[PDB]
Nucleic acid binder design. Structure first.
Ligand SMILES: CC(C)N(CCCNC(=O)Nc1ccc(C(C)(C)C)cc1)C[C@H]1O[C@@H](n2ccc3c(N)ncnc32)[C@H](O)[C@@H]1O
Ligand SMILES: [K+]
Ligand SMILES: [K+]
Length: 550
DNA sequence: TGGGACTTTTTGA
DNA sequence: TTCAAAAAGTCCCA
């Protein structure tokens, strides 16, 4: 399956990571460094390590010959020494190890067979017999849906310090690498960036912060590093050195449309205008890692201090309907099959794209709220001609197999009363803040999140005021500071972060609310000349900036 | 083949 | 009993 050009780490990144770890190695003082890659594959990293080592030994061959055994340190012996004592690799694929072993053997190209330290094993189960000086590589990423159940139980029992709930497989590789790193060693890996902000990575970030000194983080944000692969990458470099001060070099990319396979070295790219550099004090990291420059930190801290309320304080949040099979329960509003379904069971259905700022597009789909169907004898045509077409798939849902749900019921139908009221809705993934007031009792899947204001905060906050500030440029920038960057121009808008947004009340409340009412009034007209909306938004942003003192 | 529009349901807790 | 998180996303066209 995984036999193609994908998953090959680009040469620029491989070269950077190998150099970053061995740039300043004192081969005279320690001529026996152990370099490990625990997901070496065909040896993208290890073959480069061999070359870097060979130059390093050959450049100091006469100093080694003089300080140590004169007969042992010769140029002809460098190849044997590297393979015996220096390069280590591990991979679960037997064929990959077979190829890597031949590649290392053919580096020199008789005598006694040289023992190459390659292991065909599960790196997370191996009883590692010693720690390592340097660890580099590109671990596998496997999410919570794509992991096997038996294997996941093992991770939960043994890697509980970093792996729980919706965590990822590469969380465990981070723990393994840190655990088998020598005092004073250096590790450098490329992994997905999502653990820097995700709720799942909370324990993993705590593990890294409390056990290694993070030297450098390269955040590519939504840039496409791996061709034809939908993943966002970062490079972490960490050590176990005794140092008094622990500051992190953060290199965050500025333009996501760059092509990495166009510059000579990654170092040239990082020092250029295509990246920004700033320092974060590792002691000042909380459970959240707020990796922003001084301007954005000052901006963020001003808003946090000024706002006395959060959305969670004043709102009730909930995820959308999860049918478990959308094609079985969602039909076009013009589908002739809806004449078989009583309007009592029909609900309006919108997708994330139907959410704009301040207002929702008119629904084009309907949801059959099948939970309200009492008996199978009644409304049999609905069960036999609409929902039953997917009966086999519906029966394969978890709650149907355990008997909690009937085969025709919605898997997670939530509570209708939550949806059939005035509320605010936003897409779960978007390029910008899009918070709308729903007036039409719209239902939606889990690609749209909703909340409504608690009764006790209705006098302080109105729906019109909230969509005003939340759709403002100030709050767009404020949310994206700590949001979870998913892919190019996509952020996660999930309650675990959206409900942490903080809000304020001051003298500008009335004028902000009135401007929001004007914007809503314009956006709902048939002859909508939606140009004045931009001007009103600009005026509102000025009031908000005045309110927060920025 | 790479870029852009859009986003299901499986899953642990 | 029933919540909400999770992109080695998914899909299509020029
Ligand atoms: C494929 C991705 C996921 N890979 C990224 C690193 C480069 N991998 C790579 O070049 N693989 C490869 C390339 C070509 C071949 C062919 C010979 C052409 C068939 C075979 C394998 C991760 C490697 O980790 C290995 N892996 C996965 C789980 C896991 C674990 N639990 N313990 C230890 N090693 C683990 C897996 O076999 C991969 O080689
Ligand atoms: K000597
Ligand atoms: K990406």
């Amino acid at each position: 399956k995984k036999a193609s050009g994908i998953y090959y780490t680009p040469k620029i990144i491989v070269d950077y990571i190998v150099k970053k770890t061995l740039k300043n190695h004192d081969i005279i003082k320690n001529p026996y460094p152990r370099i490990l890659d625990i997901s070496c594959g065909c040896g993208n990293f290890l073959l480069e390590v061999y070359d870097i080592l060979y130059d390093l030994f050959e450049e100091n061959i006469y100093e080694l010959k003089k300080k140590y055994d004169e007969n042992y340190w010769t140029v002809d012996n460098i190849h044997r020494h590297i393979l015996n004592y220096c390069i280590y690799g591990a991979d679960i694929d037997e064929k990959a190890i077979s190829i890597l072993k031949d590649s290392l053997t053919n580096k020199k190209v008789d005598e006694s067979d040289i023992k190459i330290n390659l292991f065909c094993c599960d790196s997370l189960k191996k009883k590692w017999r010693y720690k390592f000086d340097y660890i580099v590589g590109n671990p596998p990423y496997i999410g919570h849906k794509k992991l096997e159940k038996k294997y996941k139980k093992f991770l939960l029992e043994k890697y509980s310090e970093v792996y729980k709930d919706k965590a990822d497989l590469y969380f465990c590789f981070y723990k393994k690498i840190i655990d088998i790193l020598k005092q004073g060693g250096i590790g450098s890996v490329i992994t997905p960036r999502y653990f820097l902000e995700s709720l799942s990575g909370k324990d993993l970030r705590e593990y890294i912060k409390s056990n290694v000194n993070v030297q450098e983080i390269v955040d590519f944000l939504g840039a496409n590093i791996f061709k034809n692969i939908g993943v966002s990458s970062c490079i972490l470099t960490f050590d176990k050195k005794k140092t008094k001060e622990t500051y992190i070099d953060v290199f965050k990319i500025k333009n996501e449309d760059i092509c990495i396979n166009k510059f000579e070295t990654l170092e040239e790219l990082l020092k250029s205008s295509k990246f920004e550099h700033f320092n974060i004090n590792q002691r000042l990291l909380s459970d959240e890692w707020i990796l922003v420059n001084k301007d954005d930190e000052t901006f963020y801290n001003k808003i946090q201090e000024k706002c006395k309320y959060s959305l969670e304080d004043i709102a009730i949040s909930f995820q959308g309907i999860i049918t478990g099979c959308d094609k079985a329960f969602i039909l076009s509003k013009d589908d002739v099959k809806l004449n078989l379904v009583d309007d009592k069971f029909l609900k309006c259905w919108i997708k994330s794209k139907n959410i704009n700022k301040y207002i929702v597009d008119k629904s084009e789909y309907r949801l059959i709220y099948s939970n309200d169907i009492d008996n199978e004898n009644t409304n049999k045509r609905i069960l036999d001609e609409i929902i039953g077409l997917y009966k086999t798939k519906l029966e394969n849902r978890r709650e149907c197999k355990s008997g909690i749900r009937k085969w025709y019921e919605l898997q997670w139908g939530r509570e209708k009363l939550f949806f059939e009221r005035k509320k605010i809705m936003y897409p779960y993934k978007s390029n910008e803040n899009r918070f709308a007031i729903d007036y039409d009792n719209n239902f939606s899947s889990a690609d749209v999140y909703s909340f409504f204001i608690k009764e006790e905060y209705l006098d302080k906050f109105s729906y019109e005021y909230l969509v005003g500030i939340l759709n403002s440029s100030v709050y767009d920038k404020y949310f994206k500071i700590t949001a979870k960057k998913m892919s190019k121009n996509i952020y996660d808008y999930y309650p675990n972060k959206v409900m942490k947004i903080r809000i304020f009340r001051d003298n500008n409340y009335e004028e902000i609310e009135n401007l929001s009412k004007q914007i809503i009034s314009i956006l709902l007209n048939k002859s909508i000349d939606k140009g004045k909306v931009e001007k009103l938004q600009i005026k509102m942003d000025n009031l908000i900036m005045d309110s927060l003192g920025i």
